[PDB]
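For anyone still unconvinced, we reproduce a single protein record, the chain in one-letter code, the fold tokenised, and leave readers to judge:
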Amino acid sequence: DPVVIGCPAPLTGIVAADGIEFQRGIQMAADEINAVGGILGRPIELVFADTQSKGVDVVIQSAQRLIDRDNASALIAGYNLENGTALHDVAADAGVIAMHANTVAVHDEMVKSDPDRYWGTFQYDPPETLYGGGFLKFLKDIEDNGEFSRPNNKIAIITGPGIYSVNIANAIRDGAGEYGYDVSLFETVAIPVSDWGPTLAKLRADPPAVIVVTHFYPQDQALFMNQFMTDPTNSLVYLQYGASLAAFRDIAGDNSVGVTYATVLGTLQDEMGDAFAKAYKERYGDLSSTASGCQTYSALYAYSIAAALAGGPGAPYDDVQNKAVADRLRSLIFRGPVGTMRFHADTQSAWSYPTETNDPSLGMPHIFSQIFDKAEDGVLIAPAPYKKAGFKMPPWM
């Protein structure tokens, strides 16, 4: 009998572009796995539900449909525009596995709130908190390697009002002290930003060693750099998420050069990572996003290994067999194109390297990049052993 895998993804609405890549990624993994017989000779079938870039009610409806109507044994998502815990009760109540990369601390706390019940839901990246803790670790390593010499001990943190930006910003604020940084500014701005002037005046009145912007819109970030660069402070700049996108580099132009950014789950640029990216672009075109497609690709591979080891998926409501599958997933150490996927037992979230573990065979690399040319993707500068270059002092420093 075929193994039915359901994918609730935002195929329409404001984040359609990511939803389409989640669909492409999971299709590619299913095709590769099926070409060698599927899971224990059972072919993988994929059913999709469009969450329309809408919120909790629609995500739940979509997940429920995949189970009730399509008999999905497992749900695999990238992210959807929900708080992060919509899937847990849907999975638990149907005795199925759900995997997501919503990238949320609320997932960790939900699983910890009732681990006996929430045995089936896994977050296959680390929560967003690691963007903050991992930034501090990154900063330590480039200082220790001689690549960055702090002009002073001050860090400035600039956040939007939402939970993702705020959680990242507070992780950095809270951790700064043990790395010998004082927070010179913690600033919350209204979004979208029309003018960074007030923030920029505070920065220039008290030039920090490091500026972190956790507000993530690429256009707002480019406007920031264009206003910053009329009179830049002597500061390392890290921009959360948006700087990873062509749109940021297009709008900032040469002002993008020197900026750093990072992802807690991304394609490595070693042989295996390069092979995935090449194959993905051959299937879907050079403008397609491996950054989103690698997520559901990796998740389905992990699932396929765990389910095979357990003797196969359970049907909906076969809690005993799906618990066996979840046990295999919970102990899995799976090295794919994004690095090692391994779970914390207590949170059922991915281990992060080098922040939580010093061994890349035991956790997922938190990859940092630095822009060197407005026309190119940033170069990987952390963590060893995945660097393609070292951090280079920004041109404004």
